[PDB]
A paper describes a structure:
The crystal structure of GSK137, in complex with the BCL6 BTB–POZ domain (residues 5–129) bearing changes Cys8Gln, Cys67Arg, and Cys84Asn to improve solubility of the protein, was obtained in order to explore the structure–activity relationship of BCL6 binding. The 2.04 Å resolution crystal structure was generated from an apo BCL6 BTB–POZ domain crystal soaked with the compound. There was clear electron density for the ligand allowing the binding mode and absolute stereochemistry ([R]-chiral center at C6 and [S] at C8) to be determined. The compound binds in the lateral grooves in an equivalent manner on both sides of the interface utilizing the same key interactions with both protein chains of the BTB–POZ domain homodimer. Key interactions are observed between the three principal moieties of the compound and the homodimeric protein at both binding sites: (i) The aminoquinoline moiety is partially surface exposed but makes dual hydrogen bonds to the side chain of Glu115 residue and packs against a miniloop from Cys53 to Gly55, between two small helices of one monomer (monomer A in Fig. 1, B and C). (ii) The pyrazolo-tetrahydropyrimidine core lies deeper in the binding pocket, pi stacking against the aromatic side chain of Tyr58 and hydrogen bonding to Met51 main chain carbonyl, of monomer A, and Arg24 side chain of monomer B. Arg24 also hydrogen bonds to the Tyr58 hydroxyl (of monomer A) to further stabilize the complex. (iii) The methylpyridine moiety is also solvent exposed like the aminoquinoline but is clearly stabilized through pi stacking against the Arg24 guanidinium group. An overlay of the BCL6 BTB domain–GSK137 complex with the BCL6 BTB domain–SMRT corepressor BCL6-binding domain peptide complex shows that GSK137 binds at the same lateral groove as the BCL6-binding domain of a known BCL6 corepressor and demonstrates the mechanism by which the compound could block corepressor binding. GSK137 displaced peptides derived from the human SMRT co-repressor from the BCL6 BTB-POZ domain in a TR-FRET assay with a pIC50 of 8.
B-cell lymphoma 6 (BCL6) is a transcriptional repressor that accomplishes its effects through binding of specific DNA recognition sequences by the C-terminal zinc fingers, whereas corepressors BCL6 co-repressor, nuclear receptor co-repressor 1, and silencing mediator for retinoid or thyroid hormone receptor (SMRT) bind to the N-terminal BTB–POZ (BR-C, ttk, and bab for BTB; pox virus and zinc finger for POZ) domain and, in turn, recruit histone deacetylases. B-cell lymphoma 6 (BCL6) is a zinc finger transcriptional repressor possessing a BTB–POZ (BR-C, ttk, and bab for BTB; pox virus and zinc finger for POZ) domain, which is required for homodimerization and association with corepressors. BCL6 has multiple roles in normal immunity, autoimmunity, and some types of lymphoma. The corepressor binding groove in the BTB–POZ domain is a potential target for small compound-mediated therapy.
Residue numbers in the entry:
A (entry chain A), B (entry chain A): 3 to 128
């Protein structure tokens, strides 16, 4: 007789993230700039919040919710922040011997606990 | 010697989407209301654009970019729109014998071509 069905699209989340990275490339509906000393990164707050305890805290603070510019701590590496923003929008964490420690430091500052734990493994591997 | 590594987080996209659905539940950084005759659905424009040709077109139109309210065609089923918004934020398409045709109609209105094609299969299955 009658048949209700819940259908799982396994590629859906990945497709969403590709499309979110494409909006970011074309600067579509980006609503915040992240300033890392001399560098700037345009992003969507919702993606930052979804990926970072720190951005979650900032944009859930009802004062800071509407900020269009966020200045990161002077100590934060721009190259490392860039790697972690790419990771947020692609699921791909790109590590070099040269940056791994800066990436891990930035991940911890950003409260990206799973990225930090993966950084720990790469360190031992090398 | 030196070892660069690009690491794939297979669960990352799914985790992002869970967190995006949680922001929507708690109405955090939602920036549009979709009015379907008598009903309203708060959402994030970036997720709509990522999932729907129609919302892609609307929010890329530089006039309509900043709209906080979108009125859908009077003919559109609210129950069907709700199913497709849940699908956008969860990857799960929930179909009943009663709504499948309305879901497919709404998917096509929204330019969600992969959802329409899956609706076609369910129709034959039942
Ligand atoms: C509070 C909560 N409960 C259940 C599920 C999810 C959440 C939080 C988690 C938060 C988030 C992400 C990634 C690393 C995080 N690390 C920390 N130390 C803190 C928050 C972190 N991001 C997010 C959203 F965009 C929506 N909800 N949440
Ligand atoms: C233009 C383009 N080229 C390559 C890759 C992606 C895109 C478009 C596709 C568009 C979108 C989604 C889902 C069904 C769509 N159906 C239609 N008929 C039209 C657009 C549809 N959504 C989206 C973003 F949020 C960012 N980019 N894009």
């Amino acid at each position: 007789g009658s048949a209700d069905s819940q259908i799982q699209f396994t590629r859906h989340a990945s497709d969403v993230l590709l499309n979110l990275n494409r909006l970011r490339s074309r600067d579509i509906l980006t609503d915040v700039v992240i300033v890392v000393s001399r560098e700037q990164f345009r992003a969507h707050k919702t993606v930052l919040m979804a990926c970072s305890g720190l951005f979650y805290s900032i944009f859930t603070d009802q004062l800071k919710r509407n900020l269009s510019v966020i200045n990161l701590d002077p100590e934060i590496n721009p190259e490392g922040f860039n790697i972690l923003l790419d990771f947020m929008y692609t699921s791909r964490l790109n590590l070099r011997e040269g940056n791994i420690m800066a990436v891990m430091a930035t991940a911890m500052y950003l409260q990206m606990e799973h990225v930090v734990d993966t950084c720990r493994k790469f360190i031992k591997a090398s």
